mmCIF file of C-alpha atoms in Angstrom:
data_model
loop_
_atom_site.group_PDB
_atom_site.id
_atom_site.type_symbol
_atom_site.label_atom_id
_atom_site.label_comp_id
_atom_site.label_asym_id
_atom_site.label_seq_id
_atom_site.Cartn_x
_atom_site.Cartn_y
_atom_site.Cartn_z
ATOM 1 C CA UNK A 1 -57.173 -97.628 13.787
ATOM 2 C CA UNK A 2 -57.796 -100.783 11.552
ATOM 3 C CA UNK A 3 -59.780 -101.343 8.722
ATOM 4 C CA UNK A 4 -58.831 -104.892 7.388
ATOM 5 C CA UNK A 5 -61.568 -107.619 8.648
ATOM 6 C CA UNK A 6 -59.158 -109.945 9.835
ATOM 7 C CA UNK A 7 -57.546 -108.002 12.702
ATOM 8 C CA UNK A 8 -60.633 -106.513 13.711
ATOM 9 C CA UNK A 9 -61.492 -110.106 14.007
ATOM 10 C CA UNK A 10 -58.460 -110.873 15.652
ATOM 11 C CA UNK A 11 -58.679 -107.526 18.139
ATOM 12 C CA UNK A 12 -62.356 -108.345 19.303
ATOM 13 C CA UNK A 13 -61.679 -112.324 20.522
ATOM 14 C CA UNK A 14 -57.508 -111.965 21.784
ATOM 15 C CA UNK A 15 -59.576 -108.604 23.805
ATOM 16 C CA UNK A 16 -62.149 -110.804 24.664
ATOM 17 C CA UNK A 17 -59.954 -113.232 26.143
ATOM 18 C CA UNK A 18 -57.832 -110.751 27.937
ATOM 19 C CA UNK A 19 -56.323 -111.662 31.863
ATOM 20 C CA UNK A 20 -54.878 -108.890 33.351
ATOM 21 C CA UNK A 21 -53.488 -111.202 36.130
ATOM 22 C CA UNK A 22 -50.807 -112.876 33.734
ATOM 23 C CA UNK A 23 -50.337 -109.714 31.554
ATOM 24 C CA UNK A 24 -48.521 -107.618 34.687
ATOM 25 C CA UNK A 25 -45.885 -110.609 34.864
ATOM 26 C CA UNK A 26 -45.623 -110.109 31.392
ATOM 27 C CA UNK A 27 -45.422 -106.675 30.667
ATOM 28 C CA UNK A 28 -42.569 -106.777 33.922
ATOM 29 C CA UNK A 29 -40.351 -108.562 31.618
ATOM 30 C CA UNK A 30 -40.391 -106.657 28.510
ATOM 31 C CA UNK A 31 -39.468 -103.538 31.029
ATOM 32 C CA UNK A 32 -42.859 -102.355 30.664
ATOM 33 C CA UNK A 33 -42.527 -100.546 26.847
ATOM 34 C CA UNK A 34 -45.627 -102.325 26.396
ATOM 35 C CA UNK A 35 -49.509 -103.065 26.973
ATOM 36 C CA UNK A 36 -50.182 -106.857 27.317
ATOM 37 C CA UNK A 37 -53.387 -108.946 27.009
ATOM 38 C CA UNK A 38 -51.939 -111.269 29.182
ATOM 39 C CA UNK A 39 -52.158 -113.933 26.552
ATOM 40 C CA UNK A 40 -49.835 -116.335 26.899
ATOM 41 C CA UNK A 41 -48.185 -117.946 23.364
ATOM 42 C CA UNK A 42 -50.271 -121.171 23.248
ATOM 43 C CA UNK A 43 -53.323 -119.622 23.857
ATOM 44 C CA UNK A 44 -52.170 -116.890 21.820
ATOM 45 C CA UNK A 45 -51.595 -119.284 18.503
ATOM 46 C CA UNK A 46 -54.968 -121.190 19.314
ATOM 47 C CA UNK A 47 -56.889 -118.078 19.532
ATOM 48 C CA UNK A 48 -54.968 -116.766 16.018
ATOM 49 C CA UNK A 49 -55.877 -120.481 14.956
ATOM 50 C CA UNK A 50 -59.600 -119.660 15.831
ATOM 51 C CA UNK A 51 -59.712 -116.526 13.337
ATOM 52 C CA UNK A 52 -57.782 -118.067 11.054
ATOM 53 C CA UNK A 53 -60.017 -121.328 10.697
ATOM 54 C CA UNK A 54 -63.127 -119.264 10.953
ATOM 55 C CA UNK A 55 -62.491 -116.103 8.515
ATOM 56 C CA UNK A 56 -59.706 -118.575 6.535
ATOM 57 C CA UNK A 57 -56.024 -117.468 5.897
ATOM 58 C CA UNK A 58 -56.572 -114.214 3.770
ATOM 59 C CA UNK A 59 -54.800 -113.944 0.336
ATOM 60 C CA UNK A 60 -51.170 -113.829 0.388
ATOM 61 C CA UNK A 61 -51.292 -110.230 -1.244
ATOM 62 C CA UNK A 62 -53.089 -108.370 2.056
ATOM 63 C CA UNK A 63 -49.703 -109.912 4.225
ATOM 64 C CA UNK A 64 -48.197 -106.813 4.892
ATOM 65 C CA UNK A 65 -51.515 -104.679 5.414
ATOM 66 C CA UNK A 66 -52.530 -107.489 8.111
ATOM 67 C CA UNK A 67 -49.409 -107.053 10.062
ATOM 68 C CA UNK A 68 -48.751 -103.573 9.759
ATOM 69 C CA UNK A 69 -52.682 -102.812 11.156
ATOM 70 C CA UNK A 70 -51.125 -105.263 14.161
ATOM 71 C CA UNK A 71 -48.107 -103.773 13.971
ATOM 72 C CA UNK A 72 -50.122 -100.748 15.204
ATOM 73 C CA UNK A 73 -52.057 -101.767 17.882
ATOM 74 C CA UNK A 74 -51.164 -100.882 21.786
ATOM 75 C CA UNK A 75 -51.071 -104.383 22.943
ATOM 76 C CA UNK A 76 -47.805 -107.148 22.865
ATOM 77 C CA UNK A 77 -49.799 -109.887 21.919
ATOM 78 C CA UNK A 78 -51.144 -107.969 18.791
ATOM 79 C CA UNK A 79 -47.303 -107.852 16.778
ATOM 80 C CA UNK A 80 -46.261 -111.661 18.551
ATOM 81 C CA UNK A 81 -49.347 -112.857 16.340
ATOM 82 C CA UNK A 82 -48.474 -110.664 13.498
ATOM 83 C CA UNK A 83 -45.252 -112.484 13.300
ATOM 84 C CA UNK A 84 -46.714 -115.769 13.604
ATOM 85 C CA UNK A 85 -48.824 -115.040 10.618
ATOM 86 C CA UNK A 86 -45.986 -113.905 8.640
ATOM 87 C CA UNK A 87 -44.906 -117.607 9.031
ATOM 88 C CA UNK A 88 -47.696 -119.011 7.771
ATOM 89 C CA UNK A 89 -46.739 -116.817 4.106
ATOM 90 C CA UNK A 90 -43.458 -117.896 4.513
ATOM 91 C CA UNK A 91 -43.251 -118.996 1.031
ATOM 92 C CA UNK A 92 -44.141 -115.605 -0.504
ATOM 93 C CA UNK A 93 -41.409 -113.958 1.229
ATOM 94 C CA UNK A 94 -38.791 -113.073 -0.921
ATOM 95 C CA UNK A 95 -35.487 -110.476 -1.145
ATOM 96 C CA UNK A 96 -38.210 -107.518 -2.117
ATOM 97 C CA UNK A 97 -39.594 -107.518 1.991
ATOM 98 C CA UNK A 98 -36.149 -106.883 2.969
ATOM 99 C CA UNK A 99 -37.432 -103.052 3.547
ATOM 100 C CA UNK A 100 -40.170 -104.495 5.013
ATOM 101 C CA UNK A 101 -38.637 -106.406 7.774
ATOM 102 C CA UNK A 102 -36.499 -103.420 8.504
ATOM 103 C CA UNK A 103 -39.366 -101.257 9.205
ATOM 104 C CA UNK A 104 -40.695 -103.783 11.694
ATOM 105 C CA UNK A 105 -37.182 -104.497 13.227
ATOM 106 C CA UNK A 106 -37.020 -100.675 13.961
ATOM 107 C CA UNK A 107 -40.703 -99.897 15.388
ATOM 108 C CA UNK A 108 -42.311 -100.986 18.556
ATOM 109 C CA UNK A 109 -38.586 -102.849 18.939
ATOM 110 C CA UNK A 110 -37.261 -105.284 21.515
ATOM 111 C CA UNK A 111 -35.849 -108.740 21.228
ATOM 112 C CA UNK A 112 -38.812 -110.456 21.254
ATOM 113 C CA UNK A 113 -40.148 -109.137 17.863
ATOM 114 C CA UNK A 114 -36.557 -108.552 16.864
ATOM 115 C CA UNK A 115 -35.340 -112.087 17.494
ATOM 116 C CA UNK A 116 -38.539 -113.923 15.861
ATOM 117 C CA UNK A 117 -37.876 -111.650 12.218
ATOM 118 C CA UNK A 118 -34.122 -112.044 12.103
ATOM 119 C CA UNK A 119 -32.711 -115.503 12.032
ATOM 120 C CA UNK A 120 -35.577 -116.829 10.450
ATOM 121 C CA UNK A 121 -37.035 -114.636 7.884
ATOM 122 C CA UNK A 122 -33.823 -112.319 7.317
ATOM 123 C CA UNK A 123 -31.797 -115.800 7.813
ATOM 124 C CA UNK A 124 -33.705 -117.685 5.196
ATOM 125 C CA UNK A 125 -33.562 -114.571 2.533
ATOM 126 C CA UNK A 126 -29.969 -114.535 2.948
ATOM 127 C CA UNK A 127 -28.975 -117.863 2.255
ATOM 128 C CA UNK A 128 -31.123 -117.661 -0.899
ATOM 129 C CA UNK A 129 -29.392 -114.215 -1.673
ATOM 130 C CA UNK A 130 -26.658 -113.480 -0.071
ATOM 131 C CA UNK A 131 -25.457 -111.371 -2.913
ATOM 132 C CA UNK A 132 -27.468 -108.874 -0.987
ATOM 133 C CA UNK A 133 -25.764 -108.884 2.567
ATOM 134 C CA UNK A 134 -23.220 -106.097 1.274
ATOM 135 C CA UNK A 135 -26.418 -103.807 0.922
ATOM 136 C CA UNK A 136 -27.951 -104.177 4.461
ATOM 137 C CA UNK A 137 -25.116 -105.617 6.937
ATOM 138 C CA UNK A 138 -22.838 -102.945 6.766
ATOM 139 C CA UNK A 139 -25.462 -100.301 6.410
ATOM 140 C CA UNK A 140 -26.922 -102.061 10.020
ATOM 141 C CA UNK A 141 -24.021 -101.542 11.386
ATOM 142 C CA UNK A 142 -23.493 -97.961 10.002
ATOM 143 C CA UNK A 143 -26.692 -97.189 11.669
ATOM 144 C CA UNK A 144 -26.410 -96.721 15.502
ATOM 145 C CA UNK A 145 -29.597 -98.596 16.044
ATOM 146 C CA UNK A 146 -28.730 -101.758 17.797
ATOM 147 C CA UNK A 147 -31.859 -104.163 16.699
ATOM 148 C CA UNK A 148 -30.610 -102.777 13.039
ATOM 149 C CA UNK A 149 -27.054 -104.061 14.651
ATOM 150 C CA UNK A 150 -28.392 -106.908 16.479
ATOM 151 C CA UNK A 151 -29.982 -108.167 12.901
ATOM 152 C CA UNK A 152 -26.168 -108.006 11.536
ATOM 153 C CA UNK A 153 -25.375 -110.435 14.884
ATOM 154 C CA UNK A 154 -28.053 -112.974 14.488
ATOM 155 C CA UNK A 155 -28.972 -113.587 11.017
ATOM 156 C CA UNK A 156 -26.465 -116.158 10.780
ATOM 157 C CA UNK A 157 -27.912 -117.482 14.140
ATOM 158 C CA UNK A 158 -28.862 -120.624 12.559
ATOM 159 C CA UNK A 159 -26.873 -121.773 9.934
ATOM 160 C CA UNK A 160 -24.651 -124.244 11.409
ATOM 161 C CA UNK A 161 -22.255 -125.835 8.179
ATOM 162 C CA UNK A 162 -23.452 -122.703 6.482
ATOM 163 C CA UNK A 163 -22.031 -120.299 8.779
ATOM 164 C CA UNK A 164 -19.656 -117.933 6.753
ATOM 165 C CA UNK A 165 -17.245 -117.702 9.888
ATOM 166 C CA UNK A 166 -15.190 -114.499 8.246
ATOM 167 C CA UNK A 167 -18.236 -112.784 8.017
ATOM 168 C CA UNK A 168 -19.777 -113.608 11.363
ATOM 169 C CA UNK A 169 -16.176 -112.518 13.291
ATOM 170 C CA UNK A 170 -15.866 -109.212 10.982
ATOM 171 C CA UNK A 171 -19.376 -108.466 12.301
ATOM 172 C CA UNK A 172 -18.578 -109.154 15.558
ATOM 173 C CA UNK A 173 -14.956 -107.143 15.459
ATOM 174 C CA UNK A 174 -17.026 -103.927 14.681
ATOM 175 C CA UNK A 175 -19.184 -104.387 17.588
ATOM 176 C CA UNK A 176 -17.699 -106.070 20.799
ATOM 177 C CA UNK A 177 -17.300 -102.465 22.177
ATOM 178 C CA UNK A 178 -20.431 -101.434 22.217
ATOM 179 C CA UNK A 179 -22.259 -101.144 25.700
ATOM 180 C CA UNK A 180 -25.478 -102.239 24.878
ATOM 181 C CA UNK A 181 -26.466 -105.130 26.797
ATOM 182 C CA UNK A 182 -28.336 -106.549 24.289
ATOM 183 C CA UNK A 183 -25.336 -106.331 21.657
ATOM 184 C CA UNK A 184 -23.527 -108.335 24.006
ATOM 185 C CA UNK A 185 -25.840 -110.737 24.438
ATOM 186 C CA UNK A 186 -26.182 -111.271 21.348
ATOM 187 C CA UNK A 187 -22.712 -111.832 20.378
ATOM 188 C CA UNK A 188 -22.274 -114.129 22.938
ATOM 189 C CA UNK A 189 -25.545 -116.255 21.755
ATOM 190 C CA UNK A 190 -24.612 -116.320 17.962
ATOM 191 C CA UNK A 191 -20.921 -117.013 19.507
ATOM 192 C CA UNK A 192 -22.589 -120.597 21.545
ATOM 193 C CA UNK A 193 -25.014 -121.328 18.872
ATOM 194 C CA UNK A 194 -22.140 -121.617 15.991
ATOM 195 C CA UNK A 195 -20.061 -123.459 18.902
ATOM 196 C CA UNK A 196 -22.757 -126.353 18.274
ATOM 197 C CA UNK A 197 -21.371 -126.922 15.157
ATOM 198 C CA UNK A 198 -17.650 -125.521 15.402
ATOM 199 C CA UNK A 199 -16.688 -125.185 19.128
ATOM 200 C CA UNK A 200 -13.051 -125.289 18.529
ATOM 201 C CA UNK A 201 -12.743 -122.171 16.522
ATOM 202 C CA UNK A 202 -15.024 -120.204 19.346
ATOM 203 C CA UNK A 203 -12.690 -121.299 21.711
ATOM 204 C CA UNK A 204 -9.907 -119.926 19.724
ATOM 205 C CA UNK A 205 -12.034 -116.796 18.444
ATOM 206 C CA UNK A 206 -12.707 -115.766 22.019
ATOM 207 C CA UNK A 207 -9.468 -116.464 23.783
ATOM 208 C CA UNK A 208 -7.654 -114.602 21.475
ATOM 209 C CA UNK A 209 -9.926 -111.560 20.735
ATOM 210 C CA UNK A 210 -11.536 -108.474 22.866
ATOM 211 C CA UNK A 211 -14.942 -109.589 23.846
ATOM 212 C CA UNK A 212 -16.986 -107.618 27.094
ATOM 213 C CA UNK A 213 -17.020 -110.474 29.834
ATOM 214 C CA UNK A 214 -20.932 -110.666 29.221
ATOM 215 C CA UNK A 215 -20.222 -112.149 25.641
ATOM 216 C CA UNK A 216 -17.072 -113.851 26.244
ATOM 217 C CA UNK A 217 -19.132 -115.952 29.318
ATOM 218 C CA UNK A 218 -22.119 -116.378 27.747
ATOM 219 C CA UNK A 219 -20.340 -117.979 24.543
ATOM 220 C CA UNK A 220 -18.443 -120.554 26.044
ATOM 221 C CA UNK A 221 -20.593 -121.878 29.125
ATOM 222 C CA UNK A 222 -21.472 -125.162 26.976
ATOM 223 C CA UNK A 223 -18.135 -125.642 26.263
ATOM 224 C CA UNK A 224 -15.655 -124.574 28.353
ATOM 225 C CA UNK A 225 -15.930 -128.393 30.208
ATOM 226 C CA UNK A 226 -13.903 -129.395 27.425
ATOM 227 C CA UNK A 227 -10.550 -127.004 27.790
#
C-alpha cells in the first residue's frame, strides 16, 4: 500500500530474498499472528544495510512515514526492520513521539516489537523526562491492554542505579494479579534484571509480597544460590 521509495526498496530485495523453509519455524514461535519472510535478524540488518547504503539513510523528517508504510505491511520482518531504523534516528527522538510509540506498541503487537520500543526508546525518553511518566504510566495501566501495561513493567528495564524502586514496586502492586502470561513474565524479568544491580531488595520485595509463581520464579533464579 506504500508510496515512500525507501520501503518499496526495502519490500522488493527482503521479498526477493525470502526462504519459506526458516520462516515456518519462525512464524511457529510468534503463535502464528504473523506472515514471515523467513529472514533471519543478521541477514535481516545486512539486507536493511544494503538499501540503506544504496538509496542512503533518508532525512530524519520522513522517520515516521518510513515505519508506519512498514508498520503496514503483512510480513514480520517488515516492522523488526522498521524498528531497527528507528535506531538509527535515535537522536531525533524526543518526548513529542511518545504518541507515536504508543500507536506502534498497540498495533500488529507482541513482545517482539513491544520489547524492542519500550526499554529503549520509551526508557531513554523517560530518563530525560520523567516529569512525563504521571501522563502515560498510570493511563497504561488504566487501559486493559497489556503491551500498554507491559510498557509500564519494562521501561525501567534497564536502568540499573537509576531504577526508581517505589515506582517500579507500585507498578508492579497494581498488576501481579493479572493472568496474562506475558504480564507475568514481565514482572518477573524487570524483577531479575533490577536484581543485577540490587538483589537484596528483590529478595525482600518478593518474599514478602503476592507475586503469581511464574514471576516470583522467574525473578529470583539468578539469585536464589545466595539465600
Amino acid at each position: 500500500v506504500p508510496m515512500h521509495p525507501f520501503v518499496k526498496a526495502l519490500q522488493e530485495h527482503f521479498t526477493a530474498h525470502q526462504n519459506p523453509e526458516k520462516a515456518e519455524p519462525m512464524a511457529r514461535y510468534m503463535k502464528n499472528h504473523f506472515l514471515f519472510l523467513g529472514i533471519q535478524t543478521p541477514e535481516r540488518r545486512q539486507l536493511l544495510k544494503d538499501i540503506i547504503q544504496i538509496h542512503t539513510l533518508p532525512d530524519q523528517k520522513d522517520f515516521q512515514i518510513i515505519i508506519r508504510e512498514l508498520w503496514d505491511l503483512p510480513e514480520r520482518e517488515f516492522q523488526a526492520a522498521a524498528l531497527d531504523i528507528m535506531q538509527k534516528y535515535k537522536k531525533h527522538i524526543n518526548e513529542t513521539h511518545i504518541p507515536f510509540l504508543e500507536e506502534l506498541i498497540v498495533t500488529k503487537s507482541w513482545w517482539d516489537s513491544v520489547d524492542s520500543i519500550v526499554p529503549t526508546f520509551l526508557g531513554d525518553i523517560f530518563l530525560k523526562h520523567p516529569e512525563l511518566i504521571s501522563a502515560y504510566i498510570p493511563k497504561w495501566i488504566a487501559s486493559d491492554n497489556i503491551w500498554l501495561q507491559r510498557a509500564a513493567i519494562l521501561f525501567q528495564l534497564k536502568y540499573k542505579q537509576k531504577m526508581d524502586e517505589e515506582l517500579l514496586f507500585w507498578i508492579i502492586g497494581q498488576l501481579h494479579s493479572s493472568k496474562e502470561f506475558f504480564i507475568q513474565k514481565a514482572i518477573g524479568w524487570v524483577l531479575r534484571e533490577y536484581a543485577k544491580t540490587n538483589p537484596d531488595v528483590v529478595w525482600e520485595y518478593v518474599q514478602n509480597n503476592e507475586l503469581a509463581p511464574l514471576s516470583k520464579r522467574e525473578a529470583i533464579k539468578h539469585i536464589k544460590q545466595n539465600y
